[PDB]
Design a protein around this ligand. Structure first.
Ligand SMILES: Nc1nc2c(ncn2[C@@H]2O[C@H](COP(=O)(O)OP(=O)(O)O)[C@@H](O)[C@H]2O)c(=O)[nH]1
Ligand SMILES: Nc1nc2c(ncn2[C@@H]2O[C@H](COP(=O)(O)OP(=O)(O)O)[C@@H](O)[C@H]2O)c(=O)[nH]1
Ligand SMILES: [Cl-]
Ligand SMILES: [Cl-]
Lengths: 306, 306
């Protein structure tokens, strides 16, 4: 069963791949146990692809970029999978590309878990580059950052001195920043904004930094700057491997994800408790109104979940 | 008992204040229950001071700044308390200043809880400005940000084009940024770095923002720029009150702190569990070595805590 399924994936049996993917997406406890045995078997193949995260707000040009980058990597001999943690016509028909929409959300955590595990199945099937994308609602960027080696952030220049749609905790996550839509009359403004952002990075990150994120400009549509974006991603990996830090980071990602599953399980028992859900609104109001102190309110919530 | 103690604090009895402060710092369950009843009684006085956070790395000039700002506010008729969540000779002898070192740490959470509650006792005693400081080890800045209205970040210019000691998730927390030590031969470099940081803020924060953080220069030692730092803090409050957003934010801080106490209690049961503490190292190793998947490792940890 489990071990035969692994070998079929290793052989390139696409049907075994899809079976296994449905197997890791499954909510049943027989499938869950099966999924983990599978992932153990496939441990030698785990890690064998480059992991690249790609984020940006809607309208930045993320689909177009991922499509153009996917084709450019396929032209270079890679096999590319694209996963969403939350269309591309050219890529969906290519035999050496794999495209899965984001899985129905048990939670962000459920989707993430499914994506992480599907990454291993795809590495086993021979995909050597995995692009993981997110639009960045809520905790989404932080989640993708924790499963990739290099996190690429796509932005737009509003003008030559302003960027748009930079969310609260996002630049810090970026290993590469791309000012996209640098074509036509707008090319001018995009390059000046990119330079200005380089200035900000030089100002703020210690000169001593092992890696400081490059700012690049690109036209996803025209394909200019795409080769350079890819060289910068490979450069990042090299600098990290060269520091003996590439594998160290992946091992830390795995441990951190272990603990976040422990945290989600323990916190869910409280947050989804029907009695907590019933009183929580009234508890929060009573804190807002000063009728209850926060410590008393916290004790009331813990009690409700007792 | 409880209600008489409140009135003494309200009257300005310093002995009742210290009693109550030891009462909120106490680990016993009779004192804890007493503390919360006290805080309920004092609910009309809660909130009556300005809450100002002040962070920066060691060597920035934070003690000197807090001392100079404290005196400047006392000269203006305020009564000032300074609390640490983790020396000032002039301030420690003034009758209208209050200085408490950081409380011995049950945890960052314990220290924070104690500081938050002591803020209420101080507001009751007539202190109308509370400065809350931290050096920024670990989760410290985020903790202070969650208990103040305006968070002031102190930095140093390494040169005229580089800042120093900017930690991972900190600029985002700042409502005001100060480039300190802008005196002598170095004044030149400090002002150019401040301008450059203003450029970065204009580049990155939407022009539409209700508040975008000002960058100021200061000499804590000479006292130049201190009045201006204080005007900018008052300006922040005004902009927030004017948007009808000042009280809304405080109410959100209280609710968020309620939940973080619930989270700490629930997570501590697992993390401090002796069986979890016994296996955790070996579990993490087995994940690192690929002998265990993360999901299996998480299940092993949850089981150990069963
Ligand atoms: N001018 C220009 N437009 C682009 C570029 N890339 C994408 N677009 C356009 O921007 C719009 C959104 O593109 P899409 O890839 O769907 O962005 P997404 O929402 O981030 O996925 C589409 O109309 C694209 O044609 C580019 O490099 N230059
Ligand atoms: N040149 C200059 N030195 C300062 C200034 N403020 C503080 N210092 C010096 O910087 C050192 C550290 O000051 P301190 O307030 O203890 O910094 P802290 O570690 O952040 O508390 C001391 O030697 C101060 O005299 C300033 O405005 N200008
Ligand atoms: Cl509690
Ligand atoms: Cl689990």
């Amino acid at each position: 069963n489990v071990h035969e399924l692994a070998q079929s994936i290793r052989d390139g049996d696409r049907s075994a791949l899809a079976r296994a993917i449905t197997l890791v997406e499954s909510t049943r406890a027989d499938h869950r146990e099966q999924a983990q045995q599978l992932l153990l078997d496939l441990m030698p193949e785990a890690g064998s692809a480059m992991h690249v995260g790609i984020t940006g707000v809607p309208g930045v040009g993320k689909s177009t970029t991922i499509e153009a980058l996917g084709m450019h990597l396929i032209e270079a001999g890679h096999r590319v999978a694209v996963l969403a943690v939350d269309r591309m016509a050219r890529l969906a028909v290519h035999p050496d590309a794999y495209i899965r929409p984001s899985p129905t959300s048990g939670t962000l955590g459920g989707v993430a878990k499914a994506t992480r595990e599907t990454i291993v199945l795809l590495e086993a099937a021979g995909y050597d580059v995995i692009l993981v994308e997110t639009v960045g609602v809520g905790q989404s960027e932080v989640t993708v950052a924790g499963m990739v080696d290099t996190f690429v952030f796509l932005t737009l220049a509003r003008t030559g001195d302003q960027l748009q749609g930079i969310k609260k905790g996002v630049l810090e996550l970026a290993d590469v920043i791309v000012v996209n839509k640098a074509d036509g009359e707008h090319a001018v403004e995009a390059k000046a904004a990119a330079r200005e952002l380089s200035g900000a990075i030089r100002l703020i990150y210690p000169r001593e930094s092992l890696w400081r994120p490059p700012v690049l400009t690109m036209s996803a549509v025209e394909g200019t700057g795409l080769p350079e974006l890819w060289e910068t991603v490979l450069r990042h990996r090299e600098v990290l491997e060269e520091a003996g830090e590439f594998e160290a980071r992946r091992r830390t990602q795995q441990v951190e994800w272990t603990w976040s599953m422990v945290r989600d399980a323990v916190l869910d028992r409280v947050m989804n408790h029907p009695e907590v859900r019933r009183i929580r609104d009234d508890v929060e109001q009573r804190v807002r109104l000063g009728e209850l102190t926060p410590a008393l309110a916290a004790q009331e919530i813990l009690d409700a979940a007792q």
